[PDB]
């Protein structure tokens, strides 16, 4: 038929044009997801060594410690978003590791022992499957 | 009449709302810093001439370059870190746009404005002992006057430990044993103010034209009102 | 001369039809000029944005140096057209708020004006997006962070409700829509610039055209509520030109004087000083609530102790302005004519000003108690419209 | 349903008035669809430019890497919307040329259509600027240099004439207008981007609206020349819908098929390969004539051995399209009705194609002889319109 | 009839005009370079696998990096000068956007695209012996395939003195005594082509959708025509 | 009067708004004229020495020679836009001075003696008033 063929075909055309326009404008996909995996081989890092990385943006720390806030008990591996709190610097490693901007100290777990910062370093959500962190 | 109460309520509450929403919200208690009033006049007029025919703005510029450009890069006036001296090109700063500083309304062909990405990739992306030592790159003082105010700038400088409790920015001007330090910080802040504030010649034309535009719109509205009122009598 | 242009365009036949025999009402009160003023401010925004688009550069390392160095110091009269733009944005939100609030007063949403209110609510929604996306462009300290906090709000929908915690990765306006996905990068700033500059003002020109046509097709509602004595009763209409086209002609000039007072002499609050610091994504400012036209909803949000229910209230408060004409069903029209609706409208207007004012203050628990007390009263205005309707339906 | 929207917008009353009882002519030939097609291509350009504005960055070091790297490789379907844009620009010039050339054929510029031709010539002039300024934006090798050579043309006015060598520093469109002054810098590219993207398409939307209104107010001219048998003679009109609104509805689809053939399968000439080299202001390409819609005037120019007289001819050839309705004064209307105007129009159309073709070839002296022979015939069409008018005025 | 002559003239001349204006203007005699046909198949399919499971595009990439990245910086694929190696950061190339190369439609997290201003200010604005010795900076091969064509690229490389009479670009592959040089230049041009041309998987979807869009518009116009023709009989 | 006061005042307002808009958009003045003077002190340059400068853009040469195309006879000072011709490089000084891109030679006056370039280096318009070139 015709009077319904025009409608069906116009709907198909509008759907294709809309798909293209949404795909161009509203789509950062497959380049936005950087990075959900965040490959962090924890078989390389030696104890009491942290790595600079990025999970959902900058930055990310990957601490590894054999023995002894504290949301998580001893797993010997985790990850913490490393940015100083009260003004936003980057603390450098080495038990505590402080940021040289003002003097804020931080335990290897993330809490603050002597605080110019008011709050600790937030635990970003993570996942460990074998020898990989998320 | 009841219409009068309706009017002075629906307009009273609206004016009171936009008043304490658009200036002087009395329930926000942000802190204020005052200039020490030992000078308060070095800063009020940075273009005030001095001896040797040099303005306070210029004296503050050279004081900033000599004792403050060591770690801060006030662009918008061509002042970059002195490591290297000068930190931009070295060799050719002109073929990077890179253009000369042309502020209101005069240009300085001796100082150049290099973009934020060309600089700090040619300059500090080989991170010298600024982000390393301090941990904090000394950010940029190009538009820090507009963001802080002369009070905060004067009270931060010469006592950075007062404003922020701990801070690896040094005193660099310690009073109670330096008689000229207050005037030094005053000339520094006067310079940083002269970068973001139009000179008295240009800052007065703005006031004149702002008064004239408002007076033009008021009188044009009033003439339209009188015209309508005179025309409505020809018709009723 | 002009007759040569009339024989070819029929301009005088359009004038003597659209202005001389338009027959507006006579008792139109002052708040009817807010539409004309919103249109004038729209023109102001377009005119001063066509100037800023010449010198603004949508790169992270180039923006805030275009707007603050180039526009303000390098370009002659560029300071003036950035002042005009940042002032017109706030005046354009304020005028549109007054416009819809005492278009609510006169119940200009009832029959036959249901459609003009739908188109007006679309205007309002896309105008929030045009002012919200244009605030990221200066790339200032609190511009960037108010954009972050404003686009992290739909992430609270992804928060687990008490039931059905599947919304995670559902309606992910965080990664899909603005914020570009985990990072605000150069591509995201380019996208926000392009949208704010051309995509939103075009679907505002279209929507304002449709709105202005629907206002004419349905006729402008008079503040009495009787809505007509048409084909009869002269001395009640006194046609548009020049009884109303010079009254608006003068109110527009006075509004422009009030506007150019803020443009020139008091703009320390439209270009806030603390936005003159270049944005760095590692340092968060102290108090980063959104801009004033969204604080009325930001105080409803972050007052419910849950985030998901706060987002549901955020969105129900917007959706109850769309369904407002379908929510109020009554023969009576104005608020002069409904003595029980006037009380609820005073309550609604007071509790909507109070939420916007409480949204500026820091989030103390007493502030949250107040923000709940006032959110309850703002919702009581919408929950009571059908009850007032049932009461008036029986007279 | 839709009746609910009709009681509030009166859409069916607008349909049965604008489409069912519009009463177009019946004998409208095929070239009357060129206006509808120019409007469709304008929509194509706006739609695909709203996409390119998201990712194009108006910096000298960033442009050509947005357009060539970002748009083409990084963005999904970005290749398609750059192909659509560069194809729509050339199709939009071609359609507008056909439109005005056989709107010249049917003498749609005579009374009472003098004003629609003036507005159309304004459309054409601002369209040259929108396509000329949008070609600099890719910042390619020949984009930049064709912009340089095109804006150095008004400098030939500053050249000393044989008399009054004062024009130097007079109408200095070199330093004042585009080319930004002695250098095409980042500020000039920002200015050209802003203008091309928003200032010119807005004063094209305004002008196309005025043009479409003036066409309706004056009525569409029929190709016979009698221009009416109105209030009488049925079976000559067969109203617009659906006799003409589906004929155009099909011609638009076929034109879009021809357009999307070039978009997809043959675009090596709209995005010319030699424009995929980043512009460096120190290396001049071999042959740098402007783009094809300006070659008809570029061949008149650079054919007169003098530069000043070449510029005067360049501008007189444009100005004789504005004054074309005032230049032709006759009761007769169509070219079917004027056997002596048809000959001059064939001469004009042939000699206007031939100039555009000769403008692509390198400037040999024989090419200049030909470009003078054809410029003479193009001017003979305008110099003969008043003579043909005097002849026909006496029948 | 006379209308038929009018039609086949005003349409014939227009088609002939837009034909020799939009493709194959037979009066412009620009010169053409041909691939030597000794291979002509290394270039036609750069994604053609080889031994060791490496495509010709990849072999050309490493050959370009090894013997051509000495002076040419093919960005859009992360290949910058080898002085220093690699010329971009050194130290941090990631915090300069600086983003990873994401071409159609796969991204390479190992190579980064640095803007034209960050690079060549951090890299070559301390002008090493490239602009000095050659006098000409070796420009950029990112989009030189699209600008020259495989014929010109193959004929320029391995005999730069043929195309341009004098040129300080060296032969760098001299035939008539090197049996593999033609295949080396062929793999180089195949790589440079694989940077600007979509792979066969993506280049075929473009053809399919281009055929489908044209077939959609043709058939939609034809259905509108048939609809109008059937409706005009209900009315006359 | 009033009905003429509105017109006069509206014309003044439109003229001011137009002046501002033209001054913002269409005005590169006083930053465009870089550089019309092009201060070139020729009291410093020693004979057979050229300077890199810019007149109406890049680049400009400033040659100084005591003794011996040739649009100008012996003035001992002039200026030539120095960019190689057939492909656009920059020749370096030292009688001839060639560009190392392809080997194009140039006399101290500007003409080509052995030409990969077809045409010489163009004489940009200049003005000498005392010890200054334009
Ligand atoms: C140099 C400095 C400047 C100097 C001063 C400038 C001039 C100022 C003039 C006043 C401007 C404000 C205008 C107030 C409106 C006029 C008052 C009014 O008219 O009252 C009502 C107006 O309604 C209406 O717009 C309703 C009123 C608007 C509602 C208030 C807006 C609230 C905004 C809240 C925004 C956040 C809320 C959204 C988030 C939930 C209607 O009353 P009526 O019953 O019809 O009777 C009218 C009388 O004349 C009787 O004849
Ligand atoms: C996949 C590949 C694609 C496949 C093919 C696609 C389809 C192509 C179809 C043809 C498209 C071209 C249309 C030609 C116009 C139709 C011919 C025509 O109709 O002829 C005349 C048209 O005028 C007119 O537009 C005048 C004609 C336009 C003039 C020519 C334009 C010149 C352009 C020059 C541009 C540079 C000049 C400017 C610089 C000075 C009018 O003739 P009539 O006397 O009224 O009699 C009409 C007959 O039907 C008798 O009944
Ligand atoms: C610098 C500022 C910008 C300038 C831009 C200029 C653009 C346009 C300028 C031209 C303005 C048009 C003025 C014409 C006024 C109409 C006069 C009129 O009133 O015309 C009427 C009909 O027009 C009608 O329907 C017409 C009504 C139907 C269409 C209405 C438009 C719909 C909404 C359009 C807005 C944008 C839509 C979205 C676009 C994508 C009357 O027609 P009659 O046959 O006599 O009687 C029939 C009965 O209706 C009697 O009432
Ligand atoms: C041509 C066209 C084709 C789109 C084809 C599409 C998406 C196919 C689906 C995607 C396919 C296959 C495969 C998947 C796919 C294809 C790729 O090429 C691709 C490329 C790069 C990365 C990834 C991909 C990818 O994933 C776009 C149309 C042109 C526009 C400008 C769209 C905007 C249109 C609007 C806004 C409405 C305007 C309609 C107008 C009123 C005309 C009415 C007449 C008719 C339309 C009914
Ligand atoms: C406020 C305003 C004032 C301009 C004031 C001017 C230039 C004064 C002249 C210049 C003066 C003193 C001194 C010289 C001068 C002043 C500087 O500030 C300056 C700053 C920096 C460098 C150099 C200078 C300088 O040289 C601009 C108006 C706002 C606009 C957006 C303009 C665009 C307007 C358009 C397009 C028409 C719209 C009209 C509209 C329909 C309303 C109708 C009602 C009424 C207008 C009749
Ligand atoms: C020894 C390094 C150093 C030098 C020298 C230095 N500063 Fe600072 N300054 C810093 C650092 C680091 C910061 C930012 C982080 C911090 O310390 O608070 C800063 C911040 C600032 C700030 C703004 C801080 C804020 O949060 O608003 C100002 C203003 C400032 N400096 C002014 C100056 C002036 C003026 C001088 C020259 C007299 C100067 N600085 C010299 C280290 C320095
Ligand atoms: C010893 C320096 C040098 C090296 C190594 C070099 N080139 Fe060149 N090449 C140049 C210079 C300089 C230019 C540009 C000016 C000129 O010489 O023509 C150039 C230009 C080019 C051009 C384009 C010239 C035009 O006008 O279109 C291409 C293509 C090219 N080179 C490819 C290559 C390839 C492929 C390699 C690696 C096999 C390579 N080059 C290695 C010096 C070099
Ligand atoms: C129509 C309603 C509009 C509103 C409510 C609006 C609002 C805003 C706001 C609040 C800003 C921030 C300015 C600042 O904080 O300094 C802004 C910036 C900007 N606007 Fe708009 N805008 C509108 C329309 C437009 C239009 C039509 C354009 C056309 C180009 C435009 C171009 C710009 C540009 C380029 C900027 C950034 C320049 C700057 O930082 O000042 N805007 N807008
Ligand atoms: C750019 C934004 C807007 C413009 C330019 C605009 C313009 C206008 C104008 C000129 C009128 C004429 C009647 C009058 O002046 O009161 C009007 C009427 C109206 N507008 Fe808007 N408006 C805008 C936004 C809105 C919004 C956001 C709403 C509702 C949420 C709205 C709702 C209405 C209603 C209900 C009327 C009818 C009033 C009546 O007939 O009594 N408008 N508008
Ligand atoms: C209306 C008539 C228009 C014409 C005739 C036209 C013509 C052109 C042309 C020839 C180009 C060069 C593209 C290339 O060579 O690759 C271009 C580029 C461009 N146009 Fe337009 N244009 C028009 C409208 C618009 C509009 C409304 C926009 C709205 C944003 C726009 C945005 C752009 C942009 C951003 C570019 C540069 C992007 C690129 O390099 O592809 N154009 N235009
Ligand atoms: C974007 C550019 C343009 C658009 C969208 C446009 C659109 C239209 C449309 C739809 C018509 C209806 C009658 C018809 O289709 O033949 C028309 C008529 C007309 N146009 Fe345009 N046009 C444009 C440019 C021009 C130009 C550049 C000229 C002249 C230089 C022009 C001159 C005319 C004339 C004279 C008519 C009346 C034809 C007649 O009534 O016989 N138009 N235009
Ligand atoms: S940011 Fe670490 S000390 Fe203030
Ligand atoms: S550029 Fe100087 S030799 Fe070709």
Residue numbers in the entry:
A (entry chain A), F (entry chain D): 8 to 75, 96 to 121, 131 to 170
B (entry chain F), E (entry chain C): 3 to 238
C (entry chain E), D (entry chain B): 7 to 401
What do the authors report?
Cellular respiration complexes convert redox energy into a transmembrane electrochemical proton gradient, which is used to synthesize adenosine triphosphate (ATP) or to transport various substances. In summary, we solved the 3.3 Å structure of respiratory complex III from the hyperthermophilic chemoautotrophic ϵ‐proteobacterium Aquifex aeolicus and revealed the structural basis for the hyperstability of proteins in an extreme thermal environment. The two cyt. b protomers bind to each other mainly through TMH1 and TMH4 to form a stable dimer. Several residues unique for thermophilic bacteria were detected that provide additional stabilization for ligand binding and for the structure of the whole complex.
We also determined the cryo‐EM structure of the cytochrome bc1 complex from A. aeolicus with the Qi site inhibitor antimycin A (AMY). The entire structure of the inhibited enzyme complex is identical with the native structure, except for the Qi site. H, but in the structure with the inhibitor, it is replaced by AMY, suggesting that this inhibitor competitively occupies the Qi site and prevents the entry of the substrate NQ, thus blocking the electron transport and the entire respiratory chain reactions. H.3a In addition, the entire antimycin A inhibitor was found in the Qi pocket and shows a strong interaction with Glu254. There are five hydrogen bonds seen between antimycin A and cyt. b. In contrast, previously only the head group of this inhibitor was reported to be bound to the Qi site.1d, 2c, 16 It is possible that this location represents the NQ channel from the Q‐pool, in which the substrates are transferred into or out of the catalytic center.
